[PDB]
Amino acid sequence: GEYPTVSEIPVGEVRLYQIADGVWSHIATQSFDGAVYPSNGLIVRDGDELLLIDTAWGAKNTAALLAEIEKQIGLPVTRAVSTHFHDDRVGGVDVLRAAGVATYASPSTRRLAEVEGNEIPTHSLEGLSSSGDAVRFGPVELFYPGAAHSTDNLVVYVPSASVLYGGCAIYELSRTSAGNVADADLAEWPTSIERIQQHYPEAQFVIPGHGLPGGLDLLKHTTNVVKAHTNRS
Amino acid sequence: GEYPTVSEIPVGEVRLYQIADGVWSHIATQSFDGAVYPSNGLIVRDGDELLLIDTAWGAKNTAALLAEIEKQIGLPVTRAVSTHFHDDRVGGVDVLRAAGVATYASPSTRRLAEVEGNEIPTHSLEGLSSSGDAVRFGPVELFYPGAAHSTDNLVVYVPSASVLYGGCAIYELSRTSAGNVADADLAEWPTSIERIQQHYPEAQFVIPGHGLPGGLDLLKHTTNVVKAHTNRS
Ligand SMILES: O=C(O)c1ccccc1C(=O)c1ccc(F)cc1
Ligand SMILES: O=C(O)c1ccccc1C(=O)c1ccc(F)cc1
Ligand SMILES: [Cl-]
Ligand SMILES: [Cl-]
Ligand SMILES: [Cl-]
Ligand SMILES: [Cl-]
Ligand SMILES: [O-]
Ligand SMILES: [O-]
Ligand SMILES: [Zn+2]
Ligand SMILES: [Zn+2]
Ligand SMILES: [Zn+2]
Ligand SMILES: [Zn+2]
Ligand SMILES: [Zn+2]
Ligand SMILES: [Zn+2]
Numbered sequence: 001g002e003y004p005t006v007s008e009i010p011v012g013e014v015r016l017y018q019i020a021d022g023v024w025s026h027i028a029t030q031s032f033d034g035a036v037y038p039s040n041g042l043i044v045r046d047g048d049e050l051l052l053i054d055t056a057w058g059a060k061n062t063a064a065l066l067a068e069i070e071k072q073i074g075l076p077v078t079r080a081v082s083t084h085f086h087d088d089r090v091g092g093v094d095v096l097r098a099a100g101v102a103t104y105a106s107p108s109t110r111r112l113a114e115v116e117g118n119e120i121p122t123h124s125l126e127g128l129s130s131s132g133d134a135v136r137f138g139p140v141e142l143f144y145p146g147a148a149h150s151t152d153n154l155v156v157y158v159p160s161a162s163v164l165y166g167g168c169a170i171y172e173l174s175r176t177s178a179g180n181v182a183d184a185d186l187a188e189w190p191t192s193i194e195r196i197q198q199h200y201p202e203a204q205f206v207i208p209g210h211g212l213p214g215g216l217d218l219l220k221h222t223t224n225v226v227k228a229h230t231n232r233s
Numbered sequence: 234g235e236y237p238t239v240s241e242i243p244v245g246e247v248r249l250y251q252i253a254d255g256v257w258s259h260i261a262t263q264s265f266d267g268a269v270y271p272s273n274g275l276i277v278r279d280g281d282e283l284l285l286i287d288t289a290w291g292a293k294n295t296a297a298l299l300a301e302i303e304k305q306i307g308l309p310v311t312r313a314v315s316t317h318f319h320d321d322r323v324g325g326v327d328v329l330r331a332a333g334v335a336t337y338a339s340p341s342t343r344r345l346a347e348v349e350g351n352e353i354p355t356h357s358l359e360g361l362s363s364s365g366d367a368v369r370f371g372p373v374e375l376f377y378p379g380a381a382h383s384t385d386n387l388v389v390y391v392p393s394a395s396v397l398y399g400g401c402a403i404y405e406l407s408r409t410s411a412g413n414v415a416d417a418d419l420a421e422w423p424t425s426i427e428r429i430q431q432h433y434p435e436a437q438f439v440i441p442g443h444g445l446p447g448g449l450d451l452l453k454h455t456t457n458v459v460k461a462h463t464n465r466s
Pocket of ligand 12: 319383384
């Protein structure tokens, strides 16, 4: 159907949106510095199990996420991957672990989460420390495009569905000014986006970390926004 | 909660919240770069008429505001004051004017609105050109504390109810980082806030331009956020 928005999702609730066969986004909302933001993650069917990409931004949301998954899909979440160290990606990992989910992230992400004081995924994703690195993880490919929104941000591609989940390294088209860039590498971000373009030029659905999905034109859009921020005054 | 938040307010709709006898805030929402922000204005009864402080941030919202006022309160809005030149304060002035509301702002605000290509209130408020200047305007006192969020920003005090409307010069507590300060005077903002404290030490209610009301604590909170931003937090 049409993608759910912040005004449709009370804080504490989670919506699912089926993108293709065996692939959903999950959408949640969270209060953040005097505003409410939407936030996307991904769900990918993994045989008779589910692979989860990112938490629902907090413990309460992540418990709600698991309940909504049980209601709409009814298959067990067995593994989760967090795509960088911020709380909209790892906040809720403890809830996932308590539910029996094996939680994963790169050593970079685990390292930074610990420094920040955020929840730490249990298992390490090896083979992703160098820009351009790709590793298979069941029904998806994990890709480290280089530093962008954060130094550790990963993107996730679902080859069966041509779905590219860009996480917070990719902006929705509606967003024409930079988001939180305190941990960003502005100098490298466009270069990292071009790596994504070069590695997944066949992508048909592109899912930003926050907001409305689109196609590959989200990449150049993000670069345009990032470059404009870079040139601020 | 009690005070309404963005989750309780569909975009295009407006809520009224009675603060004290004959004093309400009006709350609306608007999209800003993929996120939704709440926004406050004020309504003050003056006899059998109403004084409006600030639009509801746009033509559609401001129409909804007038309809909600007539539905809930049922007294005519005869005058409106915009507290600075940004769209969330003058956006909807044309709607007000068309509806027979006399619109006001300082000459400074009117000029800046014009340069910005925004809607321009009809009438000019004298006696507010120097920091520390105050004038009575019906049931309120208008106060120019000096440059802060903008060089023209006004604050409004309702002496009958000890209600201080700080507009966007005052941040809500949940806001711990500076917002849009493109037009701000960061150097003078703390000094301007101190003028507010000095003039209205007896204030019991403090309404920020966006978000939850509180007490006079919101002033020093705002000063802390501004000084941190000044020092590149
Ligand atoms: O990804 C973004 O750009 C973004 C967009 C909207 C709101 C917040 C962010 C954000 O960065 C964030 C940082 C830390 C955190 F705990 C949660 C989120
Ligand atoms: O008052 C603020 O700091 C603020 C808070 C939330 C969202 C926007 C703003 C804002 O500055 C704004 C600037 C220009 C404009 F046309 C409308 C609003
Ligand atoms: Cl495990
Ligand atoms: Cl395991
Ligand atoms: Cl008039
Ligand atoms: Cl008149
Ligand atoms: O994020
Ligand atoms: O504003
Ligand atoms: Zn982030
Ligand atoms: Zn394990
Ligand atoms: Zn994010
Ligand atoms: Zn403003
Ligand atoms: Zn007139
Ligand atoms: Zn404002």
